[model samples]
Target: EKLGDICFSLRYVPTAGKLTVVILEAKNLKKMDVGGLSDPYVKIHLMQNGKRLKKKKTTIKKNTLNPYYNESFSFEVPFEQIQKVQVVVTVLDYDKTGKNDAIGKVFVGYNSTGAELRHWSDMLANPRRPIAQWHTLQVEEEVDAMLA
Candidate 1:
């Protein structure tokens, strides 16, 4: 059940209420194709205290286990509520014929655990500086309610 690895960065400015995310790249993703390759893409999600906020996505890279998504997505949050929000980066397989379920996901920011928490803390300590990090993807045995 090997998932994948995602490279991304997070930055936040408390006074300005600006939070930005960059989907840098990914590798060794789950296979969705019979041919041993997949049309992989990135889905960026933001939610606050169980309330769904915004979702953004990257373009598809056909037939590859590794994809580079040099895309930036930003979110605006009130200074007070910033600590209650989280970002979920999903490496999803874009299917041509049927359902396009998520392949794996990486969570960071408030409420995240382990490395996720560390990255979020680093970003906070540095303020507007974008602190990029590599995170191992977590695969759910079944889809969660967050996206269902």
Candidate 2:
């Protein structure tokens, strides 16, 4: 996990059956640019069966290590299936070629480590309220499998 990281509020509203991921901000993201900083963008996805069902992003920040993205996007998940949902987050840098290099990544659900698993658990335990957390980001192995 990188020392530089993120904050988020995964609020699940039972009234409307939606999960709103509020990208509050990130701090001291690992430098990924030639000019000693990286342009940061945030992407949110609701993943099921190794397939991304919904996607959302914030506009790119130019030459920034920590971008204050007070952006919020959401997805609707069935109540029954919500128990099995896993959310994915990535903080990235966009290059001139429009390609992205992911520098920071986070996973929140069953397989996640100490910090985020409890965050998800806490949200599920209390519906219709927002729970926020400070978390670390890291690299992931190419374990994209099991949708066959």
Candidate 3:
């Protein structure tokens, strides 16, 4: 668990009977050092009440200046019991100090509105990556599953 790694709110309602979609876009992701991860990678973890539901990691595509990522993920929301939902993004870089020092971390949710994205130094919030950079990560949590 990368403490204080940044988290976002994702409000979903299973009662609404809609699928939750997630899209990620990363920029200026620094590469890892030799014998360690170089290119920047990210893992999107879904959580409810601070409990992990599903964790998905992205693979580094290649090295580029304006390297963009568009991945989509779908999940079912047990809105009834789910008081809150959050998305945690960890930028995987070289653990220089044997600790994760990602360039940035991001969280997104239903209330994730009016978010801002400045530049390579800022998080990609409500940017083209949200759609054009949609990643296909499907998490199906049946209503009955939550009961168990």
Q: Who wins the TM-score comparison? A: 1
Ranking 2 against 3 by lDDT, winner: 2
Question: Model 3, clash count?
Answer: 16
Off by over 4 Å in 2: 1-3, 142-148
lDDT of 3 by residue, 1-148 (tens): 1112222222233455333434345544444454444555566776765568888766564443224455555566554533355555555553436764455554444223224112211222322222222222112232113322
Per candidate, the number of residue pairs that clash is: 0, 0, 16
Q: Once all C-alphas are superposed, what RMSD does model 3 give against the true structure?
A: 10.8
If both were scored by TM-score, which would come out higher, candidate 1 or candidate 2?
1
Return the TM-score for each candidate structure. 0.91, 0.88, 0.50
Better of 2 and 3 by TM-score: 2
Report how far off residue 123 is in candidate 1 (Å). 0.8
Residue pairs in collision within model 2: none
Shift in Å, residue 45, candidate 1? 1.1
Give candidate 2's TM-score. Answer: 0.88
Please list the Cα RMSD from the true structure of every candidate, rounded to 1 decimal place: 2.1, 2.5, 10.8
TM-score of 1: 0.91
lDDT order, best first, reads 1, 2, 3
